[PDB]
């Protein structure tokens, strides 16, 4: 059921000048599309989706975690903190920080939440707890986006990303209220309109989380997609390229998503 229909991913990544990794799962039939799916790619900001899921998992054991107000100093505001910068003088709840990390990729919010979970090893531990043996977060923010060729720090694979995303959004890794909250945050993402969403018809529901490291042509998106009248699709698209100055491409991510949907026989 893997790659029943071949798609021209090699030509796409060659035109891009780098490597594209794709894993897509039809959760109804179990059919998959897989291209470089077990290779490691930098997570970049895409770790923040799993971070929010880890917070939700903790909230199952800590009632009122999500409503806890968190105050922070100006030293917490790092570049690209578009939401948390507007609440510096007031604080934000854990739930608000989680929403900002997912939907705006807010860096200060993600750092505050990572600290709460016990740092990179704490998030990695959460992923191990759902059965993901590939994911690793190693560094704190900014540093973790170095995207160095061959460096396994702060990486996962498209396959493990998709498998974990399925468990968290559709499976049993979260309790049902927390699962729907995670789905709702992903559905409200604002940063992915030119990536997987650009391949998804407007009348289908979709949630996603993006990442862009800013070097080595490295960017990504993962998503759950609900085509009407059939089971949902879970997919991940990650890119990298050999040279530090190589640029990422949103168009290549959308094109790879289109090829994945075509490979699954999803009319869209």
Curated annotation (Swiss-Prot):
Keywords: Antibiotic resistance, Hydrolase, Plasmid, Signal
Record-annotated active site: 45, 143
Enzyme Commission identifier(s): 3.5.2.6
Regulation: Not inhibited by EDTA, inhibited by clavulanic acid and tazobactam. Inhibited by cyclic boronates, including vaborbactam and bicyclic analogs of taniborbactam.
Alphabetized InterPro entries for the sequence: Beta-lactam/transpept-like, Beta-lactam_cat, Beta-lactam_class-A
Binding site for a beta-lactam: 45, 48, 80, 105, 107, 210, 212
Coiled-coil segments: none
GO biological process, one term: beta-lactam antibiotic catabolic process
One annotated GO molecular function: beta-lactamase activity
Keyword Hydrolase attached: yes
KW GTP-binding (keyword) present: no
The reaction(s) this protein catalyses: a beta-lactam + H2O = a substituted beta-amino acid
Pfam families according to UniProt: Beta-lactamase2 (PF13354)
NCBIfam families assigned to the protein according to its UniProt record, in alphabetical order: bla_class_A, blaKPC, classA_carba
Entry similarity comment: Belongs to the class-A beta-lactamase family.
Function: Class A beta-lactamase which confers resistance to the beta-lactam antibiotics, including penicillins, cephalosporins and carbapenems. Acts via hydrolysis of the beta-lactam ring. Has penicillin-, cephalosporin- and carbapenem-hydrolyzing activities.
Further remark: Initially two different KPC beta-lactamases were identified from two different Klebsiella (KPC-1 and KPC-2); they were later shown to be identical. The class A beta-lactamase family has a specific amino-acid numbering system, sometimes called Ambler or ABL numbering and often misspelt as Amber. A multiple sequence alignment was used to derive a consensus sequence and then the consensus was numbered taking into account insertions and deletions. This allows use of identical numbers, e.g. for active site residues, despite differences in protein length. UniProt always uses natural numbering of residues, hence there appear to be differences in numbering between this entry and some papers.
Protein name per Swiss-Prot or TrEMBL: Carbapenem-hydrolyzing beta-lactamase KPC-2
Organism: Klebsiella pneumoniae
Record gene name: KPC-2
């Amino acid at each position: 059921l893997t790659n029943l229909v071949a798609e021209p991913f090699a030509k796409l990544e060659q035109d891009f000048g780098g490597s594209i990794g794709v894993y897509a799962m039809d959760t109804g039939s179990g059919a998959t599309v897989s291209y470089r799916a077990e290779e490691r790619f930098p997570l970049c900001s895409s770790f923040k989706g799993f971070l929010a899921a880890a917070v939700l998992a903790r909230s199952q054991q800590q009632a009122g975690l999500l409503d806890t107000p968190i105050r922070y100093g100006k030293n917490a505001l790092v570049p690209w903190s578009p939401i948390s910068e507007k609440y510096l003088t007031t604080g934000m709840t854990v739930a608000e920080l989680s929403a900002a990390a997912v939907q705006y990729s807010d860096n200060a919010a993600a750092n505050l939440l990572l600290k709460e979970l016990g740092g990179p090893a704490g998030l990695t531990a959460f992923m191990r707890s759902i059965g993901d043996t590939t994911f690793r977060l190693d560094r704190w923010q900014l540093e973790l986006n170095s995207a160095i060729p061959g460096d396994a720090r702060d990486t996962s694979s498209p396959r493990a990303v998709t498998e974990s995303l399925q468990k968290l959004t559709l499976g049993s890794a979260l309790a049902a209220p927390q699962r729907q909250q995670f789905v709702d945050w992903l559905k409200g993402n604002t940063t992915g309109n030119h990536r997987i969403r650009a391949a998804v018809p407007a009348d289908w529901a979709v949630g996603d989380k993006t990442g862009t490291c800013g070097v080595y042509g490295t960017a990504n998106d993962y998503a759950v997609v609900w085509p009407t009248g059939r089971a949902p699709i879970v997919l991940a698209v990650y890119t990298r390229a050999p040279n530090k100055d190589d640029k990422h491409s949103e168009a290549v991510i959308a094109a790879a998503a289109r090829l994945a949907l075509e490979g699954l026989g999803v009319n869209g």
